[PDB]
Design an enzyme around this catalytic site. Structure first.
Site, PDB file in Angstrom:
ATOM      1  NE  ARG B  95      -3.303   2.601   2.709  1.00  0.00           N
ATOM      2  CZ  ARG B  95      -4.171   3.193   1.897  1.00  0.00           C
ATOM      3  NH1 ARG B  95      -4.623   2.588   0.811  1.00  0.00           N
ATOM      4  NH2 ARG B  95      -4.600   4.419   2.185  1.00  0.00           N
ATOM      5  CD  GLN B 162      -8.180  -0.774  -6.823  1.00  0.00           C
ATOM      6  OE1 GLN B 162      -7.343   0.081  -6.519  1.00  0.00           O
ATOM      7  NE2 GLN B 162      -9.417  -0.466  -7.212  1.00  0.00           N
TER       8      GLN B 162
END
Ligand SMILES: *[C@@H]1O[C@H](CO)[C@@H](O[C@@H]2O[C@H](CO)[C@@H](O[C@@H]3O[C@H](CO[C@H]4O[C@H](CO)[C@@H](O)[C@H](O)[C@@H]4O)[C@@H](O)[C@H](O[C@H]4O[C@H](CO)[C@@H](O)[C@H](O)[C@@H]4O)[C@@H]3O)[C@H](O)[C@H]2NC(C)=O)[C@H](O)[C@H]1NC(C)=O
Ligand SMILES: *[C@@H]1O[C@H](CO)[C@@H](O[C@@H]2O[C@H](CO)[C@@H](O[C@@H]3O[C@H](CO[C@H]4O[C@H](CO)[C@@H](O)[C@H](O)[C@@H]4O)[C@@H](O)[C@H](O[C@H]4O[C@H](CO)[C@@H](O)[C@H](O)[C@@H]4O)[C@@H]3O)[C@H](O)[C@H]2NC(C)=O)[C@H](O)[C@H]1NC(C)=O
Lengths: 200, 200
Positions: B95, B162
């Protein structure tokens, strides 16, 4: 273990492959193909020993067992995660295999993300930059495909992006109909269309 | 063009950024973060000049405009391609941003595939291997997430994977509840759990 136990010795003709078993991939890897990221190095056996890797991913004939539902990541309900999407012009896709197939992938994903066996890394000694069955295409006309994440398999992290083109046609049809354009990967490594950072 | 026209000169304090505009990313890139693949080199401006890049991807205040529907690739009908999927134990996600967010990504995708502006590449000079807002997690307990392909944006190819974790909780909640485990990326570069090819 970490031995060649359980593999298949191909003999001197397979001298360029791990354990002389071309299923396990070449001893010398392609020179310019990204195999993994830095945070998770590539391992052709998925952290297992060859016999454990063969036991897990091959059948009784020694042929590789392949993921269900065309290798898409399956949702919680067991249904493949995908959807019809348009590939914009300029998008770069690649494929391991002949043009008579109908599956392309986002070219920028490392090999660890495609969830493909190490055999596909076999490389032509005359053109050693990329594997022998490796082709790169650039979409030159917007092509709708059913695209989704690649399910982990063969001990690989997977989760790359694959695109089924069969709703329109196989890669050969896409070239013939000006949907895709064959590219030279060894020539694309030297490409740099833009402003380099040195100009600042 | 290929000039610093239209950028924002931050002064000597921004001497480590392109055109002294920290929006355009650092002059010196992270040392160990894969920015692209070999077939498609990374270009912080997407092949455009800074002013063209700012004009295309920033608003009137100069703040970056971000993709719709949480950055998922949208289907032909304009609906995000995603689905509830379980992340198996051992999966590595990363992230760019604080742990109070709820979006992780497949760690093996190069930066060109995350469709994130070049600002996130700013790097702490004390730990220059990876950007300052970069964190790597390993799922230690199976975590269901809504995962999908990343839509191209900011001139980047995108198409990475994602995963929205907000159905369970933000990254902080996942750590506190033993769903995720913080990793050291500079330590993972040296990791190699498996049989090396030298043993054959
Ligand atoms: C993208 O992801 C989607 C979502 O999973 C995939 O869609 C699946 O596709 C398969 C193959 O076409 C479908 O399986 C077939 O379903 C038939 C009945 O479909 C109805 O009922 C089911 C109930 O579960 C609903 O999900 C579905 O929407 C329909 O209402 C069966 O008759 C078929 O059986 C025949 O084929 C199978 C092959 O597995 C044989 O085993 C059988 O013997 C028989 O010959 C078949 O099962 C599946 O239903 C679809 N799922 C969903 C949720 O719709 C896409 O395939 C995928 N795209 C790509 C390119 O991978
Ligand atoms: C994964 O991908 C899916 C598929 O696109 C996304 O699902 C969409 O999510 C958004 C946000 O929740 C939904 O938009 C909202 O829909 C409401 C009505 O929903 C019904 O009707 C639509 C008709 O188009 C159907 O698609 C839908 O299934 C339902 O039957 C509206 O009332 C909402 O409006 C409110 O919010 C919007 C925010 O955009 C404001 O602009 C409005 O003023 C208002 O406050 C809203 O539009 C959308 O319908 C969903 N799509 C589908 C196809 O179901 C997921 O969000 C995505 N997941 C992640 C994590 O990104």
């Amino acid at each position: 273990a970490c031995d060649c136990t359980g593999t298949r010795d191909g003999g001197s003709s397979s001298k360029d492959y791990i354990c002389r078993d071309a299923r396990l991939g070449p001893t010398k890897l392609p020179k310019k193909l990204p195999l993994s990221a830095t945070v998770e190095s590539y391992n052709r056996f998925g952290g297992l020993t060859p016999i454990q890797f063969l036991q897990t991913w091959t059948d009784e004939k020694g042929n590789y067992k392949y993921p269900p539902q065309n290798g898409f990541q399956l949702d919680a309900n067991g249904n493949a995660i995908n959807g019809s999407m348009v590939l914009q012009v300029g998008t770069l896709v690649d494929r391991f295999g002949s043009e008579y197939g109908s599956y392309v992938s986002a070219a920028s994903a490392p090999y660890s993300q495609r969830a493909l066996p190490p055999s596909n890394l076999a490389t032509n000694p005359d053109t050693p930059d990329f594997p022998y069955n490796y082709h790169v295409y650039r979409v030159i006309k917007p092509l709708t495909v059913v695209g989704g994440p690649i399910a982990p398999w063969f001990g690989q992290p997977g989760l790359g992006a694959q695109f089924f083109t069969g709703e329109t046609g196989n890669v050969k049809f896409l070239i013939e109909q000006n949907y895709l354009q064959k590219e030279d990967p060894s020539a694309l490594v030297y490409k740099s269309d833009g402003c380099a950072d040195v100009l600042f």
